[PDB]
Write a protein that binds this ligand. Sequence first.
Ligand SMILES: CCN1CC(Oc2ccc([C@@H]3c4ccc(O)cc4CC4(CC4)N3C(=O)c3ccccc3)cc2)C1
Ligand SMILES: CCN1CC(Oc2ccc([C@@H]3c4ccc(O)cc4CC4(CC4)N3C(=O)c3ccccc3)cc2)C1
Lengths: 223, 229
Amino acid sequence: ALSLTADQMVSALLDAEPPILYSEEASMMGLLTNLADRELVHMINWAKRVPGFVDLTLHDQVHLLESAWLEILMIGLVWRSMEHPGKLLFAPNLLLDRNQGKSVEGMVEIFDMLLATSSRFRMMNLQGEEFVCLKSIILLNSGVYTFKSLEEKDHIHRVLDKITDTLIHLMAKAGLTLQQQHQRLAQLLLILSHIRHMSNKGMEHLYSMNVVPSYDLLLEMLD
Amino acid sequence: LSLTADQMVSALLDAEPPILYSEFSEASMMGLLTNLADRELVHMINWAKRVPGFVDLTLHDQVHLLESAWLEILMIGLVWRSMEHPGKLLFAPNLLLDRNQGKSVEGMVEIFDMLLATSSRFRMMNLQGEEFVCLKSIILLNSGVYTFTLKSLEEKDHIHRVLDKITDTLIHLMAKAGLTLQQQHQRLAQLLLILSHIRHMSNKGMEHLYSMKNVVPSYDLLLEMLDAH
Ligand SMILES: CCN1CC(Oc2ccc([C@@H]3c4ccc(O)cc4CC4(CC4)N3C(=O)c3ccccc3)cc2)C1
Ligand SMILES: CCN1CC(Oc2ccc([C@@H]3c4ccc(O)cc4CC4(CC4)N3C(=O)c3ccccc3)cc2)C1
């Protein structure tokens, strides 16, 4: 895992991308819940293809997915919605705007944060290569502060360090100056703080109404 | 936005608020911590108004940024004060608590466990003071910028330019310390990913404060201290 080149890390992450799933006012939360449940399975198979992930124990793989899964669903939604300003593309047959999110209490606040994240992506001209790097960072970093355990944390940080090398490489070969490379790297990672914030408020909203996937479910999906 | 990296560091170190003291029983613990945080918030306002570029914003946006960031800023200051005291949080020099004293309140030890892990991460990275004040200023400018008109557009462009000047400042600090370009990028990323956990901590932290209940500084109170005459 730690021997891959920057170009090979990108190629591995791109090839590992999950498919875009389809949907099957009151029934809206039923559709969105069922869509997320089916996405999670493909998320598990994506995670196993993130270089270095399967080197961790099963127990540590599950905990990483427990802490990261909602963030990953969200950043994928934000990416899907990037070229659809003012709307969220949950699925190709489920394109919702801000108005349809007002039906549920506490819903449009998260809707607006997702819309603003997608606009932020738009005006940074986020590239697919960068997006898959960002998604893998969320997987490895979201649970690292909440765990042999020293070796696992060291391994996680080594892989996080190579993704950083990979993001700098993509920026460098795009023509960015060294100053622009540091600045863009920081800009992308500060967005990860807003995604974590979005995921926290999203979880609170979910709990205000089977909220999280169980440890046994995640473990079984890992196979 | 005209400062050099050294002038940025120098200004941020000069803006650093003082370390305050608590004014022992677990029953009075929340009263002491609440009073301490309330007094820290006054000095936080003064500190924020000295962070370069912050006063260029409208008072309205200044209030909004502090509304979104004040808990994060209190928490990172706590973690910084606790860095050299493993397994303990130094709320004040006369108020140093361990994990067993955080068990008295439901849901306290979980957030407490999170703060201890961040303190240990600061130790593991040998976080420097110059890096710490840069992180704190990034928290101020970044946490509320994604949740704000033409004025609003000009504000976010200015905030991102100041955030860019701080990123340059972090890199210059590591470059002066002999780290390679690779090590500079990697440490930059490691420091900024901690901000995700600090936002996470402040989020459960806000949940725990509402679970107890004057939970948050009000908009009018923040505006009053910011809007000086
Ligand atoms: C055991 C796990 N199951 C229990 C289920 O929890 C769910 C239930 C529903 C969602 C959807 C969903 C679906 C697919 C997607 O790609 C993304 C999302 C995004 C989002 C934010 C989270 N969501 C919403 O409706 C929403 C709410 C308020 C404001 C805006 C959007 C995700 C997870 C999953
Ligand atoms: C109106 C504004 N008021 C101020 C608000 O109330 C309070 C009351 C108390 C705290 C302390 C406090 C004080 C000083 C510090 O530097 C840091 C902190 C940190 C922390 C997490 C936040 N806190 C706790 O006790 C705690 C809780 C659960 C787990 C661990 C620690 C902050 C704010 C309401």
